[PDB]
Amino acid sequence: FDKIKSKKTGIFQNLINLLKRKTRCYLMNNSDSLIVERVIREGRLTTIKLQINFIITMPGERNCFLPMSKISIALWKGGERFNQIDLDEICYGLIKEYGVKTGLKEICNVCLFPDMYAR
Amino acid sequence: NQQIISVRNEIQELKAGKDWHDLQNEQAKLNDKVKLNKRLNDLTSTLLGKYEG
Amino acid sequence: NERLEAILSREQNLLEETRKLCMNLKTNNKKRLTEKLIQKDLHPVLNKAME
Amino acid sequence: SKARKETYSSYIYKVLKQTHPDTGISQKSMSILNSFVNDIFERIATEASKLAAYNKKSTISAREIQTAVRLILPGELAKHAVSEGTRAVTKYSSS
Amino acid sequence: RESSKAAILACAAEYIQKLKETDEANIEKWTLQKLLSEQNASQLASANEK
Amino acid sequence: ELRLEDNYVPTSDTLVVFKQLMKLPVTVLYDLTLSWFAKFGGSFDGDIYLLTETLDLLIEKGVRRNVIVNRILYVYWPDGLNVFQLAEIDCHLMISKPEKFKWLPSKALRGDGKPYVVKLQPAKFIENLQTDLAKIYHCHVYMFKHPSLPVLITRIQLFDSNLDKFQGKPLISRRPYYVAFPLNSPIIFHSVDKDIYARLVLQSISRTISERETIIFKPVQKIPVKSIHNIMTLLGPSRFAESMGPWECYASANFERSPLHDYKKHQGLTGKKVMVREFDDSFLNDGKEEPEIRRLRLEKNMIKFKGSANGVMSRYSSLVPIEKVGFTLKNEINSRIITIKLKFNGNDIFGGLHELCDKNLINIDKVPGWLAGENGSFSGTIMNGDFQREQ
Amino acid sequence: KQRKDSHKEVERRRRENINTAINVLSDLLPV
């Protein structure tokens, strides 16, 4: 549990470092989830909002007896939440391809920087 | 009696090969990658309008 | 003896119909790789995983 | 553990084969006939050596056994017994 | 580490043809790599200029 | 359809089976024959109790084994015994004299190259194997567990019809074949024969075990092994496998006791004693000696060839004696590769080498592990200081 | 004719098999 908490904080701090100056970002929920944000220029001051979760669960009930962790993400454009099934599968695939570290940095690249990215 | 044993041995030999496993794993990877590309293109367009779902 | 002939024929036909699927899968995989995710619609994200 | 037990059952069965070749023996009957010979052996030998002690002679011998058997057996069986003992010992000494 | 001479010859032939087969695929992969790399470079240059 | 049943009678030579029967003691004969009459009866007239008292009175009179064997072969079952009894006698022979039989190992593998831990319920296996084999040959199969090991053993025998003969209609026998299965391991043990019948058999086991995913058998060794105990020790699911030779004490695991064990008798306080080694090579150079240092020299040889000072199993007999091993060293000198191939033969190679070490013909400190006995029963090539089993 | 399976024929099969191995190896050579 101690080492996994340390790793959790490490992943968050690395993401914060990779995003801090280009997009200010707010760790919240007693260090469990963080928020990032950029203003889309397609529309006049169109905002895009993303927040991520890394929850650690202590054992006791239903497979093993060890502490284990979970990742999930959420996205909004203009306050409008995007359907969570496809977003979760995106999180799943990109994390599996690039791990949590580079995978989540790249999730933020996708979600907070599409306008650059169209081609 | 010889021929039956020979053909049975060939039948057993075929399905345990490395290539038979590798091709299926590769096909699964292709399917995953194409689905991921579809989803990424769809969502980035949705972020940028001009989406035409 | 003729019963054994029949058994031999059965094993041979099932062997052949199982054999063809390997070539089917190989060609299908090659074609799908070369067309579906090599054309220019690839999301530049997956460029790293693809290389 | 269990030590090997003395028995005459093989000889009893063999003499029954000589008498009635087609006949078998029950286990209880075989124990009975195994006890027969030991009982007779004792009640002959004790009387014979007691008679030897009456003679005040050291050796228990053929005459003592002959006298003991002819004392203790009923007479009709005793005649056969002494005749068979005498002919058996004679056949032996003729070796 | 084969021992018998016949096994040695068979393994040598198999190894030879396997090397020959591997070379062609190794050659083929590079063209796809070139395509992907130039596509990524062009995409990034378009990103920079736009 | 063609599956046989226990009441059928095969044909064979009577004298050979008589000689086979003579190996067994009297008591097992009594038990086997009582069971046979109980299940099948016999030509003899009388109740089993009558049979019981006849057999009894025969044995307390001290009759010889020949009488009982002749009775069995000529009055009780004069025309010949059933296939079941023929299998049973061989079962008892194997159990009584295990060292007379030879085995080979075989490893079960699945598609991805992983070991396939075979787990077997006997009923499904036996019915499936019988149905698979009956379509090609007439087969009787008998299955049993070893009295003192966690192994299931199977005996397979094949029959065919008829040199010339009229309408007697028997089926002539053939040399049997054997297979064994440990409870939870990827390994299979089977007899040493390469006739097409054995190939058909082994192929049938490989076909029938699967039931959910394909399975194939890959041999791991080319030289047979005797004494099913030994091959079980070497390759069965156990602690000794991959801890052989100098590494046996971990398989024993008695050196260490559980942590909550008492303090004062924990061996750490008490310790032990050992001998100091010497490294400048004085061996080839050359009673002027005293007991204690010689004692610990012998202990050094003991552990180098046995792994424990007390010498966990004479002082030379090893855990599993090895009859043959072939090694092949490959070393690089001045960019030139050099081959040395050693071949040993005997009843216990490493015990003999240990004896030579005791007689001081070989230097202990320069005996490598592969020569000492680790990788036991595996002939192979050594490169880069790492053993590699021969293909 | 003469029936026999011993020396003078059993070695021929071994020689032929090794020769075929040599031939298949040689077929792959550049020259």
Cα–Cα distance, A34 to F378 (Å, whole number):
59
Instruction: Report in angstroms the alpha-carbon separations of F109 from F115, F116, F118, F119, F150.
Output: 5, 5, 10, 13, 22
Q: Which residue reads 């058996």 in tokens?
A: D88
Amino acid at F324: K
Interface membership of F381 toward E (CB under 8 Å): yes
Q: Would you give the distance in Å from CA D64 to the centre of its chain?
A: 14
Interface membership of B3 toward C (CB under 8 Å): yes
Instruction: Report yes or no: A92 and A102 within 8 Å, Cβ to Cβ.
Output: no
Instruction: Give chain E's radius of gyration (CA, Å).
Output: 21
Interface of F with C (CB under 8 A): 135-136
Angle F34-F37-F40 (CA atoms, 0-180°, nearest 5)?
A: 145
Instruction: Report yes or no: F326 and F349 within 8 Å, Cβ to Cβ.
Output: no
D25 lies in which domain range?
1-95
Instruction: Tell me if residue A3 falls in helix, strand or coil.
Output: helix
Interface of A with C (CB under 8 A): 94, 97-98, 106, 109-110, 117
Nearest to E3 among F383, F388, F390 (CB): F390
Cα dihedral across residues G5, G6, G7, G13: positive or negative: positive
B1:F136 CB<8 A: yes
Pair type for strands F216-219 and F102-109: antiparallel
Cα–Cα distance, F200 to F160 (Å, whole number):
15
Closest Cα partner for A104 from A11, A27, A41, A6? A11
Instruction: Report yes or no: D64 and D51 within 8 Å, Cβ to Cβ.
Output: yes
Token pair recorded at residue C32: 């799908």
E40:C38 CB<8 A: no
Taking CB atoms and an 8 Å cutoff, what residues of chain B touch C18?
Answer: 11, 14-15
Strands (E), chain A: 25-28, 33-40, 46-57, 68-77, 80-81
Instruction: Report yes or no: D44 and D78 within 8 Å, Cβ to Cβ.
Output: no
Cα–Cα distance, B15 to F111 (Å, whole number):
7
> Chains near G, with 3+ CB pairs < 8 A?
E
Helix (H) or strand (E) holding F225: strand F225-226
What residue in C sits closest to F137 (Cα-Cα)?
Answer: C4
Burial class (CB in 10 A: 0-12, 13-18, 19+), C27: exposed
Q: Which residue reads 């794993």 in tokens?
A: B25
Interface membership of D8 toward F (CB under 8 Å): no
A90:B43 CB<8 A: yes
Cα–Cα distance, F373 to F358 (Å, whole number):
16
Measured between its terminal Cα atoms, the distance across chain E in Å is: 61
E6:G21 CB<8 A: yes
Helix (H) or strand (E) holding D34: helix D27-55
Cα–Cα distance, F4 to F171 (Å, whole number):
12
Q: Which residues contact F219 (CB under 8 A, 6 or more apart)?
A: F104, F105, F106, F107
Pair type for strands F225-226 and F102-109: antiparallel
Preferred mutation among A49, A77, A84, A107 to probe B, highest tally of B CBs within 10 A: A77
**Rounded to a whole number, what is the distance in Å from the CA of D9 to chain F's nearest CA?**
7
E39:C38 CB<8 A: no
Token pair recorded at residue B4: 């039956």
A116:E47 CB<8 A: yes
Token pair recorded at residue F174: 């053939």
Cα–Cα distance, D64 to D73 (Å, whole number):
14
- What's F247's DSSP letter? G
Instruction: Tell me if residue F9 falls in helix, strand or coil.
Output: coil
Strands (E), chain F: 102-109, 138-145, 151-159, 177-182, 187-190, 216-219, 225-226, 324-333, 336-345, 380-383, 386-389
E46:A119 CB<8 A: yes
Show the DSSP H helices in C1-51 as ranges: 2-36, 47-50
Cα–Cα distance, C41 to A16 (Å, whole number):
31
Cα–Cα distance, F381 to F389 (Å, whole number):
6
Instruction: Report yes or no: A48 and A37 within 8 Å, Cβ to Cβ.
Output: yes
What total number of domains does chain D contain?
Answer: 1
Helix (H) or strand (E) holding F332: strand F324-333
Chain G, 1-31: which have a CB under 8 Å from a chain E CB? 17-18, 21-22, 24-25, 28
Instruction: Tell me if residue F174 falls in helix, strand or coil.
Output: coil
**C-F contacts (CB, under 8 Å):** 3
The experimental technique used to determine this model is cryo-EM
Instruction: Report in angstroms the alpha-carbon separations of F390 from F309, F328, F373.
Output: 32, 10, 16
Closest Cα partner for F353 from F333, F327, F391? F327
Residues β-bridged to residue C15: none
Instruction: Report in angstroms the alpha-carbon separations of D82 from D34, D75, F96.
Output: 22, 10, 55
Pair type for strands F380-383 and F324-333: parallel
Token pair recorded at residue B9: 């041995």
Interface membership of A119 toward E (CB under 8 Å): yes
Instruction: Tell me if residue C14 falls in helix, strand or coil.
Output: helix
Pair type for strands F138-145 and F380-383: unpaired
Closest Cα partner for E11 from F297, G24, F318? G24
Cα–Cα distance, D38 to D34 (Å, whole number):
7
Cα dihedral across residues E34, E35, E41, E45: positive or negative: positive
Closest Cα partner for A50 from A108, A90, A98, A5? A108
Instruction: Tell me if residue A80 falls in helix, strand or coil.
Output: strand
Taking CB atoms and an 8 Å cutoff, what residues of chain C touch E28?
Answer: none
Judged by phi (left if over 0) then psi (alpha if -120 to 50, else beta), residue A79 lies in left
What residue in B sits closest to C29 (Cα-Cα)?
Answer: B27
Closest Cα partner for C34 from F201, B34, E21? B34
What residue in A sits closest to B51 (Cα-Cα)?
Answer: A118
Token pair recorded at residue F325: 């091993």
**Residue D50: CATH number of its domain:** 1.10.20.10
Cα–Cα distance, F230 to F136 (Å, whole number):
34
Cα dihedral across residues C1, C5, C10, C15: positive or negative: positive
Show the DSSP H helices in F185-290 as ranges: 196-209, 228-235, 248-252, 267-270
Cα–Cα distance, D11 to E8 (Å, whole number):
76
Instruction: Tell me if residue F14 falls in helix, strand or coil.
Output: helix
Cα–Cα distance, F3 to F135 (Å, whole number):
9
> Got the DSSP string for F113-151?
S-B--B---HHHHHHHHHHHHHTTSEEEEEEEE-TTSSE
Amino acid at F124: K
Closest Cα partner for A36 from A97, A90, A91, A104? A104
Please state, as a whole number, how many other Cβ atoms lie within 10 Å of the Cβ of residue F111. 19
Cα–Cα distance, F316 to A106 (Å, whole number):
66
Nearest to B4 among C7, C26, C41 (CB): C7
**Rounded to a whole number, what is the distance in Å from the CA of B17 to chain A's nearest CA?**
27
What residue in B sits closest to A117 (Cα-Cα)?
Answer: B44
Cα–Cα distance, F371 to F237 (Å, whole number):
25
Amino acid at F362: I
Taking CB atoms and an 8 Å cutoff, what residues of chain E touch C44?
Answer: 39-40, 43-44
What residue in A sits closest to C42 (Cα-Cα)?
Answer: A119
Helix (H) or strand (E) holding F329: strand F324-333
- Helix axes of F48-60 and F26-40: crossing angle, nearest 10 degrees: 170
Judged by phi (left if over 0) then psi (alpha if -120 to 50, else beta), residue A74 lies in beta
Cα–Cα distance, E45 to C44 (Å, whole number):
12
Taking CB atoms and an 8 Å cutoff, what residues of chain A touch B36?
Answer: 90, 93-94, 97
Interface membership of A45 toward E (CB under 8 Å): no
Cα–Cα distance, A105 to F24 (Å, whole number):
79
Instruction: Give chain A's radius of gyration (CA, Å).
Output: 15
Please state, as a whole number, how many other Cβ atoms lie within 10 Å of the Cβ of residue F106. 20
Interface membership of C47 toward A (CB under 8 Å): no
D26:F56 CB<8 A: no
